[PDB]
Assembly symmetry: C6
């Protein structure tokens, strides 16, 4: 059984409350897909004489696709206004034998809706893409052993605003 | 039963009266599809020292596709002349069990036809794309409960001319 | 029964006499398809202080596709020479129950062949695309009632050379 | 029966003798397809005060596709050297009931091979595209009546080097 | 039987320990595909008067595609931070009758993760592309005789940082 | 029976010895496809007053696709180093009834590997494209009569370094 599901929750002063009725994500947004891109310009053939490298990594926006729903106008206005959210969390699920597993969890700190792109076609459920831009990110991947049983998590992080491996927006 | 339908009405001094015979949209335009794009350039890693952020959101034109019909020359001339309409309303429908639901309603204030792109091919019903540019927008999404019964509406808005969350073109 | 047909007639000093044997369009060109584009740059968020707006609409060429035939060299030479035609008329037909209807009629005033693009492939009837550029246009769409019976025509027009809604090239 | 065939003959000091064994085109090149493009920049909304218009038409190269054969190295060298040919003739054939008809004939005056693009793939007969650039062109289209019987030819021409409707390279 | 498999191991201060349970690559990353590009600008029609040629080869990043797994956040952070690895080794396998053969082995010296591009779609196993940039490379191709039996290896190398055929990053 | 085959031999100080076991090409590289492009900028509507034309032909690299094999690292290093080869020969074969014919032979003088682009995918035999840049070329096409029996060869040539029809790199 496929048990794929992705859920998003906004946490800030402005509310983007979703429609999900999943017991573990009541009021979260249900989304269909996710894509990202990270690009590091640092040279492998030149090095700084000292401890300062000018360039830094570029993180692209995280882009999600979702069905149009009651959260859509909320996203459209939030994008237009440039409202900042303290945190956004995204949980990713897949099948794990008899129950699902949250294999990936992403937390974004100091977040804006950078784009929304809605369409209604003649055929098919209407959908929109939306992008998120952020100051810091914490990624957690949940491992399992050969029996599919949960082993330890791998947690990594990056602060674009501090240029350090921290889940922190401020200095 | 699929009950998809999109209807557009122009409201201004210049008439773009449509062909629809739908009881609830007599004389509106029937259209086939819609697409939009909203892009916010605001940074998540830098902030203004004060309360002024230079950049603002960019709303792309709202683009509709429709069959060529008697409104087509009206659109072609309105686009050519750059006539402004006080308001344009778009109603979006889908199935809701035994009757249809208007799941999305968009009102645009101070509107121009920014483009029209008609084609007649050897095969298929002739169609055209047309785009609308506007000073302000009000979006209403009509929610339903788990039984499909109407719950409360979500209404949001944005004024490009005022740079505020208002359905107003003028200051 | 599909009764799709498009006919073009050039009216000027230089003759581009066609091959059609249709009783109502003897010697017109038979063409297969048509495409156009109209783009209005006027802003919806800024307005002139006075009555003058700098920019004007851009009409793209009207582009037609036709089978290669005896008119082809006539088009190739007319395009090369830049001959101007006083008028070009295009009639568009579709089925209307037992007889066809001219649903769209376009008249172009002060017209040049702006491009011709012929091909002969290994397979298929050879065809060419050709484009027309013009000073003014009159568009007529022929309406029908719910019984398919002719109702009134919708006629609109635009003069690119006068920047007014007129079917006139000269001032 | 399809009787499609295109034949090309070079006429100049440098020989590009072909492989055809067709009785009417012995030693011509057999080619598979042809494409061209003619673009006229003249405005329909502005006119010269006098009798001089600056811009002129742009004729693209005539591009042919053919199987690789013994003429291929001849084309490759002629293109490399920039050899000029006094004339190149191209005859185009299609079915006409019981016999074929030369529906199109093109003569090019003062001609260069402007490009050659050969490929050998794992599958399929190797082919190359080649382009011809020229000073003047004469196009002849052979008409037929409703019975398919030959009627009169349509002959048109253009000199790029003289900017007149003449089949002449020199002044 | 297809026995295709590609394995990657990072060797540096920062750990990117993988998930593989293959007996010969325990804890390596399993990857699905690889692509590269090498471009030499040196002219064949001009030569230096002396022994110095200005330009040098450009090696593109080596790009791998892999399933998302517990190493993914490790790659995302390593790319973000620009961590350098002393060495990365990649082993490539295919079938060789009754057992597999390592037909290609690549060692990269002084290596950075230059890009990572993860996606989760509605359908299909989530994957990411990642790119590696490096100072030097050693390529080993393992040959076999007509009986499929191992013959001698072909080993070649290049140092981008020294511009010589050496597997060395430093001078 | 298809008897398509392409073989390449490098002849220079640096060895790029191939894997072929074909009796007539022992140790040559077997390749799968070939593509080229030759472009002549000379005008057909303007001519030099004297005997000097500034521009010259541009030959693109000759691009080959081959399976990855033991020659691959040799190509990768040769490209990286910019090694020059005195000559490279390419023989092209197709079926000729009961035996194959070498229909095309290309010799390149003073040659560099200008690019190599290898890929290993999940499915399919790994392949690479490689390009060759050169100072001169001799092309030989082997003709046959209507009975498929060998007739005379057509040999043509071009020197990019001398700008003459010669198979010579040096002056």
């Amino acid at each position: 059984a496929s048990m794929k599901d992705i859920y998003v929750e906004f946490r800030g002063k402005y509310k983007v409350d979703g429609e999900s009725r999943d017991s573990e994500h009541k009021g979260w947004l249900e989304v269909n897909s996710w894509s990202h891109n990270i690009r590091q310009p640092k040279s492998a053939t030149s090095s700084s004489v000292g401890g300062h490298t000018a360039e830094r990594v570029e993180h692209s926006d995280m882009v999600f696709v979702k069905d149009l729903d009651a959260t859509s106008p909320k996203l459209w206005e939030a994008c237009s206004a440039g409202y900042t959210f303290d945190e956004v969390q995204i949980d990713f699920y897949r099948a794990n034998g008899d129950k699902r597993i949250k294999y990936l969890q992403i937390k974004l700190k100091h977040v804006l809706v950078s784009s929304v792109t809605p369409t209604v076609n003649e055929e098919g459920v209407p959908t929109e893409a939306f992008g998120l831009k952020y100051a810091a990110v914490e990624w957690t991947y949940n491992q399992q052993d050969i029996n599919g049983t949960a082993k330890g998590a791998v947690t990594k992080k990056w602060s674009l605003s501090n240029n350090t491996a921290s889940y922190a927006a401020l200095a």
